Design an enzyme around this catalytic site. Structure first.
Site, PDB file in Angstrom:
ATOM      1  CG  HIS A  98      12.897   7.998  -9.864  1.00  0.00           C
ATOM      2  ND1 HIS A  98      13.778   9.019  -9.551  1.00  0.00           N
ATOM      3  CD2 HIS A  98      11.776   8.595 -10.350  1.00  0.00           C
ATOM      4  CE1 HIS A  98      13.207  10.181  -9.838  1.00  0.00           C
ATOM      5  NE2 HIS A  98      11.987   9.952 -10.300  1.00  0.00           N
ATOM      6  CG  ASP A 102      16.928   7.168  -9.336  1.00  0.00           C
ATOM      7  OD1 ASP A 102      17.088   7.439 -10.544  1.00  0.00           O
ATOM      8  OD2 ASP A 102      16.237   7.841  -8.551  1.00  0.00           O
ATOM      9  CG  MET A 140       8.796  10.465  -1.505  1.00  0.00           C
ATOM     10  SD  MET A 140       9.704  10.301  -3.086  1.00  0.00           S
ATOM     11  CE  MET A 140      10.499  11.900  -3.226  1.00  0.00           C
ATOM     12  CD  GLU A 198       7.465  16.464  -8.244  1.00  0.00           C
ATOM     13  OE1 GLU A 198       7.720  15.330  -7.767  1.00  0.00           O
ATOM     14  OE2 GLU A 198       8.338  17.312  -8.557  1.00  0.00           O
ATOM     15  CE  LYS A 223       9.001  20.122 -15.345  1.00  0.00           C
ATOM     16  NZ  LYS A 223      10.011  19.193 -15.907  1.00  0.00           N
ATOM     17  CD  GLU A 274      10.595  20.390  -8.741  1.00  0.00           C
ATOM     18  OE1 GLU A 274      10.500  19.184  -8.503  1.00  0.00           O
ATOM     19  OE2 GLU A 274      11.226  20.843  -9.688  1.00  0.00           O
ATOM     20  CG  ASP A 277      10.195  17.544  -4.977  1.00  0.00           C
ATOM     21  OD1 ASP A 277      10.219  16.811  -3.957  1.00  0.00           O
ATOM     22  OD2 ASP A 277      10.179  17.101  -6.133  1.00  0.00           O
ATOM     23  CG  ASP A 279      12.051  21.657 -13.742  1.00  0.00           C
ATOM     24  OD1 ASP A 279      11.868  22.472 -12.808  1.00  0.00           O
ATOM     25  OD2 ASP A 279      12.144  20.425 -13.550  1.00  0.00           O
ATOM     26  CG  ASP A 289      14.991  20.649 -11.322  1.00  0.00           C
ATOM     27  OD1 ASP A 289      13.910  21.261 -11.141  1.00  0.00           O
ATOM     28  OD2 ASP A 289      15.011  19.467 -11.743  1.00  0.00           O
ATOM     29  CG  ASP A 292      13.401  17.116  -7.722  1.00  0.00           C
ATOM     30  OD1 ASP A 292      14.488  16.760  -8.264  1.00  0.00           O
ATOM     31  OD2 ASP A 292      12.268  16.913  -8.228  1.00  0.00           O
TER      32      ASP A 292
END
Ligand SMILES: OC[C@H]1O[C@H](O)[C@H](O)[C@@H](O)[C@@H]1O
Ligand SMILES: OC[C@H]1O[C@H](O)[C@H](O)[C@@H](O)[C@@H]1O
Ligand SMILES: OC[C@H]1O[C@H](O)[C@H](O)[C@@H](O)[C@@H]1O
Ligand SMILES: OC[C@H]1O[C@H](O)[C@H](O)[C@@H](O)[C@@H]1O
Ligand SMILES: [Mg+2]
Ligand SMILES: [Mg+2]
Ligand SMILES: [Mg+2]
Ligand SMILES: [Mg+2]
Ligand SMILES: [Mg+2]
Ligand SMILES: [Mg+2]
Ligand SMILES: [Mg+2]
Ligand SMILES: [Mg+2]
Ligand SMILES: [Mg+2]
Ligand SMILES: [Mg+2]
Ligand SMILES: [Mg+2]
Ligand SMILES: [Mg+2]
Lengths: 386, 386, 386, 386
Positions: B53, B56, B87, B180, B182, B216, B244, B254, B256, B286
């Protein structure tokens, strides 16, 4: 006091009030209903019309002469009552031949048989005046990963719907198709499991304008999804051709409770949306009177479906007409959501320094959305505390 | 023994190994990682590249001069290691200004700010060589029914993506977008909640060929859906631009988890599908090393992601190469699924009496599908008992 | 019109209205509230009392002198307002030391520290007049199978609660313990995940009469269970010491919506049950004003919690007082459910030929239960259509 | 290579391999099996024994003379094959009379009939040598809130089990009872929905030592719970009398897949636990060969159940014997979890300043748990990559 009339367009499947109560763990608790008596009883309750699978009306295996006798008796009850038949569908799930599916069965000869059984009923539906032909692929799916190559299955599914579309256009029929998604049961996973997957699939058909969706409250809720949101997406796409109304308590087997049972607040937002978007199709109940009930409970359950829709319609209309709610919608900036983000265009957005360089991110962040006050006004209206 | 190389195209988000362990009930358990040290450590483990991102890499609020210093340090670590950046994406969810969303915030000025923050990072992504730009609308949604008119929100969402597409085509950039989905978390319900809803939405954009999906594993499983089926539908549509990978134990928050944890058999069928369809994009993880771990556990968890993919790849390849499996696939008629139902056309189907009038429905019904033997062969291969 | 008074025994945790809005994907949207201002604001809204974790009231790490200053300010606000403190609890989840749990951490020294931190707050709770001490083991659990031997963990959990019980009995304190179950989040799976598991565990403690449950609406619904059924089982066992009221939309992350949101019909049956069983403990709201809200939305959300309880209480009381409902309950044989099956004893049952040899199974099978008519009467009362 | 023998104690219900494939949407796909042929076929596959409902063995309505003929044929097949009958149970769910339940039906005469039908089969079970008598209350429950006062229902349920316990003790029978929980299906919610609720209920029976649980993999997973955790709690309580093994893909209808399908990693941890705790009861498969299969697929599916247990048993034993795993368990402090928190007692804990005043909370917090490395070792063993 919440009495339905045929002008409310409430319809019922023959298989709903006619469900005998056989579940995977128990025998039937009710005798079979004659379709003629179901039509008469539903007309007395204020229904607008009925729907059917081919096999609800014409017992599987009937000779062409018995077929004609079944249709004639049925047509006479429609004439006697004024009931309409706005939707029909094919049973491609009960007979053992369909155990691995109809349109996407691995066996090619079953897939051809499925198509011929469908086409035969499309002709009948048109004869009875149906405007929508529903397809619920309840056996299209798999319990294990290697049993079904899903890309090939989707090719076979596209092939089948394209052939149906070629058939209705070559016959000159005014009928459209609606695909009814369901995420699972009776297969471990069903192809096109949600509204969204069905909408996406339709865009790859040869004649997409002939196909829409027939979403069911309980089916989207079996994936934990927000049913009014999914309906909004279908309306936004112009694809809400029909709808199945019922109730469901969360992620479990398909309960098919009467409409208004299950998630009551979702029922309220669904009615608000259908009424404010001007949905004018049938309000169809695909529900099963619980097998605890005798025949009087069957008709009470059916009446409850319609009663609950009409109560919710009244409460949603009051909510949207309340000046205090109209004030609160502006307080939460619903009006601003409806205005274009950048009608000034891309280049103006890029040169607009109030959109980035001089945007006061901390002031915008501090603004409350006032959603809790709005939602409590909605609760007060639903409960008649306003 | 299952050692990755950059040729395997494994990538990681900076935010994955850099997750400090802050969850809704607890403080961070790990200090922040410098992006430069993450790039170096991931290169030593055999990764191909990293993703980021904007926030980040460049701390929110940075002056343009600090921005240039952050990018230069980052670029130097890429040069030193050979790591790629395939990406990039925008953080439109952490800052309080985004509490009601970015592209579909009710406040118009926030929506314009969201677009400007995205466009700024698209330029940076192109500079670093990213080929895919991901959008995860994590704040686009609602906790209550009246807070969001979803039709207007979808208009605003289409407006935003159309503007992004106008921007990249007017700049001449070779970058594509991947949405993406969710279903929920952090909003009560998120717009475009599944692969299918995202695929359907893309077909209404002005330039649909620029947009695909970034599904994902864990997100589709939070709706109880079959992830390999959803990937197959995305491949069938030609829209799988990125993926992902991670793990998830069923319908809950979630998690992950590292890839291979959660639903192991779904991981096996996913790898089988990606490898046999020739997916050639990044294998992006991810995931979040659990907050029980110290830094050595972070790198062990990251290594496990890649190790599990390579083990599953080996077992899926053995499964498909096994002559006994090839025999069983024919026994279950997977070959017949791949053959057209009616290449002879509609009229031939209608005149074919072996498709209906003379079809032996009871003989076809008695044929077993032999799926359980096939699935046990798949189990034996996964477990190395073959 | 549904105005609360302190006689309604509504209470709130300091952490509910004080939640700053930090979620796993976003920063805080609201500044911290001084506990003193929360007590004053809640008293103005009609609350009866507040609850706290040790760390809500006394910032972690405080010297004993700062501790005394925090308690004195708090006590003064209680005196000024008349607010009570009926329940207190320990924060054994936020600090990183608790990342693998408190009572069931693998590290023995953390488990001892957890016990000392709890005992310290039990003394404070007693000083402020709390009658119930809640334990929510939010970090007791695991993300992976080998991390936690659950039999040893349950030994450690029994050890900790037995020590707490030895402590309160040796000090002569009049306080009881309530265990609050939750199935998951923040751990992948939490030990004692439901009401039932907690009830079963209490029966193995040395002094079971000191321990009960503090069920939370949303937590049982995160396992898809029927919350009023689980409360009924807790009342039947004599163990409902306290209750956390809020709202939850199905199986997903813990939303902690205001009470009445989420599953509205379950809220109605819960209130009906608490009121008709004469539950006399606090009506405690463990909820989080959504992070979209500013401070005015926080207090509107808190007021809504109480308003919805009082509306539901009125509708449930009307339902049970309606002669038509009393008639319908007899029609569905609720009266017969309350009569012993075999007060005549085992031997009389065995000799009773009307119970088997001469029992007319087909006549009994044909009787309808009339549940749908009863449930529509309940719907009509909830909606104010009666 | 993973061949079962009767020493492995694998058992099957007559209703598992005998399931004809009738589901709520479809007719049977397989003819009925004679119980005698099922016993013979299962003996050839290496099974240890079979289980039955009364109605699987003796068709409902049989005269006492037909009853004796059915039992004699069955006993002869047991003698011919060496097969045992370790468990029996009562069908209190298929016949319409049980539509509102058996022990908790609202109608008192149905409850008495349910008890007489059970007692009759307890005598038969004892005659055939069964050691465990299972009760699955599949119809004890409700679809709506007002249909069932759950406190009265639990009184009726306690009444029924107490009478059964009085009966077996007065007859001098060596048989124990196991309650099998299920959260829903076929009722909307079932009473005692999970292992924990059943364990808690047993503690209120007059003779608790006669009652334990018969948990089923898929049933706890239909509530999203961790099945090995729930088994651990049952073993900890000393109540695991029997177990039903099968597979389930998440929260949906009860799939009853063959064991090893569904959640493979949960199957691995379950076998690890049963084997390391020394469970010595039957390994009973309550599964349904999918209705896609013919009779050869039925026996392949049954063989797969046993094969998967034996493969998982081998991989779990290798995992626990691996010195590197033993090292990692100590690295994650599983040894410390097994040591008492405070064997020195309450007073020593209170005076121990290293437990609080001088406890270094930041040093303890920094320690990693090393769980990800342990879990990847477990993954490597499951997959045969070690
Ligand atoms: O296709 C029409 C109907 O057929 C079946 O009865 C399904 O269960 C129902 O969901 C569907 O709407
Ligand atoms: O958009 C890229 C990523 O951003 C956020 O971290 C999300 O949690 C993740 O799901 C997403 O893939
Ligand atoms: O233990 C008291 C409270 O502590 C935590 O805030 C939990 O999230 C809540 O569920 C619990 O009730
Ligand atoms: O009671 C024994 C069995 O009876 C029924 O077949 C149930 O479906 C199964 O779960 C149960 O174990
Ligand atoms: Mg349905
Ligand atoms: Mg349906
Ligand atoms: Mg339907
Ligand atoms: Mg995720
Ligand atoms: Mg994610
Ligand atoms: Mg992601
Ligand atoms: Mg909660
Ligand atoms: Mg909570
Ligand atoms: Mg709570
Ligand atoms: Mg089952
Ligand atoms: Mg079962
Ligand atoms: Mg079972």
């Amino acid at each position: 006091n919440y009495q339905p009339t045929p002008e409310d367009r409430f319809t019922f499947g023959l298989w709903t009030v006619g469900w005998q109560g056989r579940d995977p763990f128990g025998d039937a608790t009710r005798r079979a209903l004659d379709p003629v008596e179901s039509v008469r009883r539903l007309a007395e309750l204020g229904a607008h019309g009925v729907t059917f699978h081919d096999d609800d009306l014409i017992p599987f295996g009937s000779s062409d002469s018995e077929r004609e006798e079944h249709v004639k008796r049925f047509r006479q009850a429609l004439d006697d009552t004024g009931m309409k038949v706005p939707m029909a569908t094919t049973n491609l799930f009960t007979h053992p031949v369909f155990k691995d599916g109809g349109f996407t069965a691995n066996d090619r000869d079953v897939r051809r048989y499925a198509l011929r059984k469908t086409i035969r009923n499309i002709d009948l539906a048109v004869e009875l005046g149906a405007e929508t032909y529903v397809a619920w692929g309840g056996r299209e799916g798999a319990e294990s990963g290697g049993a079904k190559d899903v890309r090939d299955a989707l090719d076979r599914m596209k092939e089948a719907f394209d052939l149906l579309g070629e058939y209705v256009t070559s016959q000159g029929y005014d009928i459209r198709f609606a695909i009814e998604p369901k995420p699972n049961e009776p297969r471990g996973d069903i192809l096109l499991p949600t509204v969204g997957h069905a909408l996406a699939f339709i865009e790859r058909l040869e004649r997409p304008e002939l196909y829409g969706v027939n979403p069911e409250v309980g089916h989207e809720q079996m994936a934990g999804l927000n049913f009014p949101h999914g309906i909004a997406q279908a309306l936004w796409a112009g694809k809400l051709f029909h709808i199945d109304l019922n109730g469901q308590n969360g992620i479990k087997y398909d309960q098919d409770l009467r409409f208004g049972a299950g998630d009551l607040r979702a029922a309220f937002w669904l009615v608000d949306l259908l009424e404010s978007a001007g949905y004018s199709g049938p309000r169809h109940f695909d529900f099963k009177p619980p097998r605890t009930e005798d025949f009087d409970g069957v008709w009470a359950s059916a009446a409850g479906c319609m009663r609950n829709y009409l109560i919710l319609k009244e409460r949603a209309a009051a909510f949207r007409a309340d000046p205090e709610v109209q004030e609160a919608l502006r307080a939460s900036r619903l009006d601003e959501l409806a205005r274009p983000t950048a009608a000034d265009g891309l280049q103006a957005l890029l040169d607009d320094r109030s959109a980035f360089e001089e945007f006061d991110v901390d002031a915008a962040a501090a603004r409350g959305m006032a959603f809790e006050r709005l939602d409590q006004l909605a609760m007060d209206h639903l409960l008649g505390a306003r």
